[PDB]
């Protein structure tokens, strides 16, 4: 337990099958960095003591994580990056639950540390292939939805007239009919006294099919399957299956990885798409000195399984916080991601043909952010509009239509070689001339 | 304050909320296809086959989830392997619409790197189709 010479092995050669972790580490004053890195590697069975007591275990001879590198953090005085290798034999095949238990289960309480943040994980191809992963992934999703060469467009339903299931469905219909691909259950809407789940499912299915008959395009609504229990959760997933509707939704951090993986497997087995909402992520991922960075939680989700993932907004963020967001968007979507520290990527990640996950971005209040969103995300993203569609003065359907026109004109202009960073305002104003809905949204 | 009409107002995915692309607008999209190394292809359908429908689901059990008929259209000739000049696509668009005047025509593109369809937008609506609105759709 934290001998510093057993666990800090700076000449260790990293194996291909090892799981690597990068911990941003804040030692207690006077505690040397090599002792802290070793303690995190060891996960000592005393978290209060910070000293070896019971030493010599067959859990600690060949099944031990080793701290193979400690680096200083530039501009910080008491922070280090500790790199820990874990042998693949430590981990239950296909169990995100068990990988977090093994890596983050105990070390964040260790008294020799003042603060500890888990920045990144290298998931080896040998571990990656044990997971079912996302039910469809971005490509299959585009083929099943018949939708190519632009972002997908969503909006959250917040009805003006009631939270009843019938009014909820009316609003879904009005948004979808105007041009949106998807609408979205709010993450807390599970099954309440004001709106029981099965009533919500039925009225949303009528709305989806009405807007689909009207538009001739495939339509969905993310039907929240998050429940108190696995049986209730599967009751809802089964209902969606039987309605023949395209997509359901889960809050993977509050439901849990065990339930999320069960759900992702149900969705693979029955062809449902799985939208993933990231409620409570800021409890864990916000503070720079402590917790688990979102890119790790996104990587976990890609392994557990989800076809879309809420990935934040880039509205109101600086270029440096935008570099970070684009880093994890590449970890979500791509097959092979190279080490890139300035994007916060600490490890080369090989997804080994595991399907990518579609990031879902909060678009802003208005449609003038559309050129920036298209330039930053590219086409493989859902842009969610929180009140673009509904702050529109003419109502949900023209608001949806204004968002769709703006997305399509920015897409057209991007393909024509125009610079959306410079000319995006000129693209929107030019589409306002022929689109009365977009012209009324830009009056706001 | 205007009302988005639900009547005869069918959409055909990417770019259908824009005015119909002119020949210069189609040529500029084909330039985007060619520069990326993508393979253009044309597809067409008659109006009754143009938009998504559920009629095959009569044969099914509880498996209709994300099944829909008429996503597939009919290929016009072959994917234009080695297409570098946009005037070939524009010629093929004219030839398809001449052979099939009552047909919607869409231009798709395939990326042989990622081995997947990567574009699809409409280049022609048939005049005889009443299913769609001429951008006075309010």
């Amino acid at each position: 337990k934290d001998y510093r010479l057993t666990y800090y092995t700076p000449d260790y050669v990293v194996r291909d099958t090892d799981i690597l972790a990068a911990f941003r580490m804040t030692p207690q004053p006077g505690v040397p960095p090599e002792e802290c890195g070793a303690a995190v590697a060891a996960e000592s069975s005393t978290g209060t003591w910070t000293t070896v007591w019971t030493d010599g275990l067959t859990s600690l001879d060949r099944y031990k994580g080793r701290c193979y590198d400690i680096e200083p953090v530039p501009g910080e005085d008491n922070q280090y990056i500790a790199y820990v290798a874990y042998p693949i034999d430590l981990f239950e095949e296909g169990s995100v639950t068990n990988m977090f238990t093994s890596i983050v289960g105990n070390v964040f309480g260790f008294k020799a540390l003042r603060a500890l943040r888990l920045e990144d994980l290298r998931i080896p191809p040998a571990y990656v292939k044990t997971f079912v992963g996302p039910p469809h992934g971005i490509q299959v999703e585009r083929d099943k939805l018949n939708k190519y060469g632009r972002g997908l467009l969503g909006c959250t339903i917040k009805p003006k007239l009631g939270l009843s299931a019938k009014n909820y469905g009316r609003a879904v219909y009005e948004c979808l009919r105007g041009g949106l691909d998807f609408t979205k259950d709010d993450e807390n809407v599970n099954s309440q006294p004001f709106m029981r789940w099965r009533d919500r499912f039925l009225f949303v299915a009528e709305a989806i099919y009405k807007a689909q008959a009207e538009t001739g395009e495939v339509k969905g609504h993310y039907l929240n399957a998050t429940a108190g229990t696995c049986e209730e959760m599967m009751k809802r997933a089964v209902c969606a299956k039987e309605l023949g509707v395209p997509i359901i939704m889960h809050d993977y951090l509050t439901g849990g990885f065990t339930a999320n993986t069960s759900l992702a497997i149900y969705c693979r087995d029955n062809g449902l798409l799985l939208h993933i909402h990231r409620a409570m992520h800021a409890v864990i991922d916000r503070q720079r000195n402590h917790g688990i960075h979102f890119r790790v939680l996104a990587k976990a989700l890609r392994m557990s399984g989800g076809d879309h993932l809420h990935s934040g907004t880039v509205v109101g963020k600086l270029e440096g916080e935008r570099e970070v967001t684009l880093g994890f968007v590449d970890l979500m979507r791509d097959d092979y991601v190279e080490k890139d520290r300035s994007r916060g990527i600490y490890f080369t990640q090989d997804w080994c043909s595991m399907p990518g996950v579609m990031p879902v971005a909060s678009g802003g209040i208005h449609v003038w952010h559309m050129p920036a969103l298209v330039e930053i995300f590219g086409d493989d993203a859902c842009l969610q509009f929180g009140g673009g569609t509904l702050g529109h003065p003419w109502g949900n359907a023209p608001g949806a239509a204004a968002n769709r026109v703006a997305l399509e004109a920015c897409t057209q202009a991007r393909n024509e070689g125009r610079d959306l960073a410079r000319e995006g305002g000129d693209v929107i104003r030019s589409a306002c001339k022929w689109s009365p809905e977009l012209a009324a949204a830009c009056e706001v | 304050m205007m009302v988005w009409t639900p009547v005869n107002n069918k959409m055909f995915e990417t770019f259908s909320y824009l005015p119909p692309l002119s020949d210069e607008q189609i040529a500029a999209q084909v330039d985007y296809i060619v520069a990326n190394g993508w393979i253009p292809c044309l597809e067409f359908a008659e109006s009754d086959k143009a938009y998504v429908s559920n009629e095959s689901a009569i044969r099914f059990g509880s498996v209709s989830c994300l099944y829909y008929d008429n996503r597939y259209w009919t290929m016009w000739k072959l994917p234009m392997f080695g297409c570098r000049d946009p005037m070939q696509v524009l010629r093929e668009i004219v030839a398809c619409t001449k052979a099939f005047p009552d047909a919607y025509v869409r231009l798709v593109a395939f990326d042989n790197q990622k081995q997947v369809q990567i574009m699809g937008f409409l280049v022609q609506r048939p005049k005889s189709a009443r299913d769609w609105q001429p951008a006075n759709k309010r």
């Binding site: - | 020949d23 520069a35 990326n36």
Partner: peptide, 22 residues
């Protein structure tokens, strides 16, 4: 994605298209 460099169409492209349509 590469930058789409433009291709000036042949001078008779409008004309070529008009003859073909007929």
């Amino acid at each position: 994605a590469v930058t789409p460099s433009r291709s000036a169409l042949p001078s008779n492209w409008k004309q070529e298209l008009e003859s073909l349509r007929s």
